[PDB]
Write a structure and sequence with these properties.
Oligomer: part of a larger assembly
Strand content of chain A: under 5%
Structural class of chain B: mainly alpha
Radius of gyration of chain B: 23 Å
Structural class of chain A: mainly alpha
Number of strands of chain A: 0
Order of helices and strands of chain A: HHHHHHHHHHHHHHHHH
Function (chain A): Involved in poly(A)+ RNA transport. Involved in nephrogenesis.
Distance between the termini of chain A: 80 Å
Helix content of chain A: 55-70%
Number of helices of chain B: 10
Number of helices of chain A: 17
Family (chain A): Belongs to the nucleoporin Nup133 family.
Subunit structure (chain A): Forms part of the Nup160 subcomplex in the nuclear pore which is composed of NUP160, NUP133, NUP107 and Nup96. This complex plays a role in RNA export and in tethering Nup98 and NUP153 to the nucleus.
Organism (chain A): Homo sapiens (Human)
Protein name (chain A): Nuclear pore complex protein Nup133
Radius of gyration of chain A: 31 Å
Largest interface: A-B, 26 and 25 residues
Chain lengths: 278, 240
């Protein structure tokens, strides 16, 4: 009750004395651990280590079925640290948990863990694609409801379409920028738009201009300046063919006139776009 | 009956259709020897002589897919036969003599090159089988057992047979590729098949069933565990 500081200070001293005696007795006979646990119902870290250092798989279940909230402590002790496979499966609870969820019959949990890992990862395009593929495979293998399966398929297709804009890079730009093939980080929408409309991409046709303008919805700074810069680059790369193709593929008030100009071909191309969009 | 159609140069399209049907019937019941005998009996220069129509382009595509599948099966069988015949170790004997020690030393010296040659040949066979499986799976203009022309006649039974053969060949090819990657020590290549079998570029997830998906998930976890125990992580990347 009163004077909680003394109770908190004595608890640490009592727990430190039990851990030192269990370390010196672990090198001898293993029969004293059960007697110590029966005498004092505390210090479960010693029992968890004794049940993991040997090939006694039933001991961990026997010490957990006859206790009070022992699985929650065992999982916390395993996550903070035959027999080796069991120890690895017990420790696999965070981060790398997809294999454990697949082995313990949990396709939905494995898919959720893979999706979380893919969302948290942002430094390896190959790893992000592999995690998304594993999550899609787990969602397809899971026997859930039709609406849930359709929602998972839509969420996977959205991520695939968002990642394709960065995965479909040109072979000339990647070789000129001295970039890695699969050892590259997850580039953002602005980085992809800047790389697709850069000076290194000499073979920038209509696809490179259409892929850069469609990535403006995944920015979450100023898109008005980027829209003008891309329009200026598409006009300068044509050497006054690309602007007309982009306008035909986009089919109209997002572009500017005076802001983009601050001349003979633009005035003739802007007059035909107003009649086709009305 | 295929010989009478192959001997006549006027019915080249009919002979090609008969050969494709025979190959499909042999693949539907697992008849590699029959498929090879039909491919060796069919004319190899018929594609350069019959040339187009919907009944001809689809037959040519089916014949090309059957030939690619037969080549991938023949390469996989050769790789398995080469991997199942590795060089054994030296026969150790306790309390040896002067001549026995020299014999054991010579055997150990010869094994140092025998094991290296067997590993090189196994790696070459695995690299060939992987390329064969990739060429059989990722096929240009459609895919494996997929007709590019959609203006043929009413061949519902033929379409169903081609779909069943493709569904039966996709899981077997995936399992063979996974086994080859696990035997050759390619954990990164084995764990990368999940994206290829789930991307929308080929739609390989629709041909697999629940058992095939469970087997693929069990193989991916076993590959990730080996990659993490070797020194890497789950996907094979370095733990920074």
């Amino acid at each position: 009750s009163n004077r909680e500081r003394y109770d908190n200070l004595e608890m640490e001293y009592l727990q430190k004395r039990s851990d030192l005696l269990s370390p010196l007795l672990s090198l001898g006979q293993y029969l004293w651990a059960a007697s110590l646990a029966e005498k004092y119902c505390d210090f479960d870290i010693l029992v968890q280590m004794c049940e993991q250092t040997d090939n006694q798989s039933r001991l961990q279940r026997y010490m957990t079925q006859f206790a009070d909230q022992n699985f929650s402590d065992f999982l916390f002790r395993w996550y903070l640290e035959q027999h080796g496979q069991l120890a690895n499966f017990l420790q696999a609870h965070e981060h790398l948990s997809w294999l454990h969820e697949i082995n313990s019959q949990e396709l939905e949990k494995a898919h959720a863990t893979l999706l979380g890992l893919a969302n948290m990862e942002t430094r390896y395009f190959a790893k992000k694609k592999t995690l998304l593929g594993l999550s899609k495979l787990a969602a397809l293998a899971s026997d859930f409801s039709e609406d849930m399966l359709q929602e998972k398929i839509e969420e996977m297709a959205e991520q695939e379409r968002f990642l394709l804009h960065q995965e479909t890079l040109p072979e000339q730009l990647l070789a000129e920028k001295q970039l890695n093939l699969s050892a590259m980080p997850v580039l953002t929408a602005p980085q992809l738009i800047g790389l697709y409309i850069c000076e290194e991409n000499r073979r920038a046709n209509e696809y490179d201009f259409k892929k850069a303008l469609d990535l403006l919805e995944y920015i979450d700074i100023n898109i008005n300046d980027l829209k003008l810069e891309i329009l200026c680059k598409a006009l300068q790369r044509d050497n006054w063919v690309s602007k007309d193709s982009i306008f035909v593929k986009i089919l109209l008030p997002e572009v500017k006139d005076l802001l983009q100009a601050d001349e003979f071909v633009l005035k003739a191309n802007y007059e035909y776009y107003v009649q086709g969009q009305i | 009956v295929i010989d009478w159609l192959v001997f006549d140069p006027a019915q080249r399209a009919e002979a090609l259709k008969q050969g494709n049907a025979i190959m499909r019937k042999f693949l539907a019941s697992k008849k590699h020897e029959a498929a090879k005998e039909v491919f060796v009996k069919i004319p190899q220069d018929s594609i350069a002589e019959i040339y187009l129509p919907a009944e001809d382009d689809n037959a040519i595509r089916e014949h090309l897919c059957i030939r690619a599948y037969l080549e991938a099966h023949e390469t996989f069988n050769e790789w398995f036969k080469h991997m199942n015949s590795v060089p054994q170790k030296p026969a150790l004997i306790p309390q040896p003599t002067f001549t026995e020690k020299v014999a054991h030393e010579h055997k150990e010296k010869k094994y140092e090159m025998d094991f290296g040659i067997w590993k090189g040949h196994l790696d070459a066979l695995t690299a060939d089988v992987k390329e064969k499986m990739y060429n059989v799976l990722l096929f240009v203009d459609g895919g494996w057992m997929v007709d590019v022309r959609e203006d043929a006649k009413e061949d519902h039974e033929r379409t169903h047979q081609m779909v069943l053969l493709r569904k039966l060949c996709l899981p077997m090819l995936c399992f063979l590729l996974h086994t080859i990657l696990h035997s050759t020590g390619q954990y990164q290549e084995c764990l990368q098949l999940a994206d290829m079998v789930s991307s929308e570029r080929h739609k390989l997830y629709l041909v697999f069933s629940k058992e095939e998906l469970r087997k693929l998930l069990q193989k991916l976890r076993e590959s990730s565990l080996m990659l993490l125990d070797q020194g890497l992580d789950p996907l094979g990347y370095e733990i920074q």
